[PDB]
């Protein structure tokens, strides 16, 4: 009825909105991480160690928007 | 308040106000300029300095925009400045709300589209006249020189050069007169006079930006 139709719009708003914050975040992180290799390539493992760890924090923001968005579709307690 | 007109019939309908308002500009242009060319002097006397400094100004916006061959196009750009400069300064300064025509207002010759799209075509013929005289009659500046696929961009650029140059001049004079028309209905004339001085400022400038840009399409066609 209305419940399955309103759950399915928020499954698109959860993911659509969640993706936006991190996309700018993972871009300015990887943007200055590769500028940093150009100033000193001897710190590549120091940069790729911190970048791949901090990009995992921004992966965790939009994966929470997909935990909700799959819960609205699949494990939906309302329908 | 009133954006209408009365038409005069000569087989077709033409605007009475536009012809009449324009005539005063014609009489105030020839009537004041030809009083100083009656007996000129070597050292310019009082009154001839202003008509010389205008003519030295028209040579500035012709030579900078056209080039070495500005000197045939001086009387054209000298008209397209002065017929649009005096038409706007007649609207703000000459008191014409005392005279009452039984059907319409009298402010400026350029308040209708019929003046402004005619002046946008008189400057449109001029860069097709300069474009087809100096260069070849077969191919001219619309020829697709940098890339062959620029054809619809450059065909449509032919239409936008008289049209954007018309509604620039048409709108800002129609706007300026309407602010005078509206604010008088609210308040007596002691309040809208700073707004009229902001309007009379841009009233002469849109004439200057006309003749500067009108010469600027001449030099593009000659290349």
């Amino acid at each position: 009825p209305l419940i399955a139709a309103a759950s399915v719009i928020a499954a698109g708003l959860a993911v659509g909105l969640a993706s936006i914050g991190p996309g700018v975040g993972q871009g300015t992180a990887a943007g200055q991480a590769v500028e940093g290799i150009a100033r000193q390539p001897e710190a590549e493992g120091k940069i790729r160690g911190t970048l791949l760890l901090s990009l995992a924090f921004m992966e965790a923001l939009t994966i929470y928007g997909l935990v909700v968005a799959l819960a609205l579709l699949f494990a939906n307690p309302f329908v | 308040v009133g954006q209408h007109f009365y038409w005069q019939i000569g087989g077709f309908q033409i605007h009475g106000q536009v012809l009449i308002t324009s005539w005063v500009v014609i009489a105030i242009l020839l009537g004041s300029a030809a009083i100083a060319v009656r007996s000129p002097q070597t050292i310019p006397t009082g009154g001839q300095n202003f008509f010389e400094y205008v003519l030295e100004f028209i040579r500035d916006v012709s030579k900078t925009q056209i080039g070495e061959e500005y000197r045939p196009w001086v009387p054209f750009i000298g008209t397209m400045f002065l017929f649009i400069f005096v038409s706007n300064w007649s609207g703000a300064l000459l008191p014409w709300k005392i005279i009452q025509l039984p059907h319409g207002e009298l402010a400026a010759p350029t308040n209708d589209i019929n003046t402004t799209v005619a002046l946008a075509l008189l400057t449109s013929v001029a860069y097709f006249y300069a474009g087809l005289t100096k260069k070849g009659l077969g191919y001219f500046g619309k020829y697709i020189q940098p890339t062959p696929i620029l054809l619809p961009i450059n065909i449509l650029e032919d239409f936008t050069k008289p049209l954007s140059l018309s509604f620039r001049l048409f709108g800002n004079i129609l706007a300026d007169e309407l602010v005078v028309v509206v604010l008088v209905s609210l308040v007596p004339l002691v309040v809208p006079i700073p707004v009229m001085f902001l309007g009379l400022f841009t009233s002469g400038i849109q004439a200057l930006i006309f003749a500067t840009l009108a010469a600027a399409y001449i030099g593009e066609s000659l290349e």
Binding site: - | I43, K97, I98, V190
Partner: protein, 40 residues
């Protein structure tokens, strides 16, 4: 016919005045300077 009313032409008055006076000023400043240049 002439439409006499003191809600248009009065304003025209003030600004025409101002304009005229200051125009006179500047034209004296800029036409007499050009005259002194050509006499120079």
């Amino acid at each position: 016919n002439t439409d006499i009313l003191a809600t248009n032409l009065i304003n025209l008055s003030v600004v025409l005045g101002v304009l005229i006076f200051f125009g006179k000023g500047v034209l004296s400043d800029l036409l007499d300077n050009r005259k002194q240049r050509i006499l120079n």
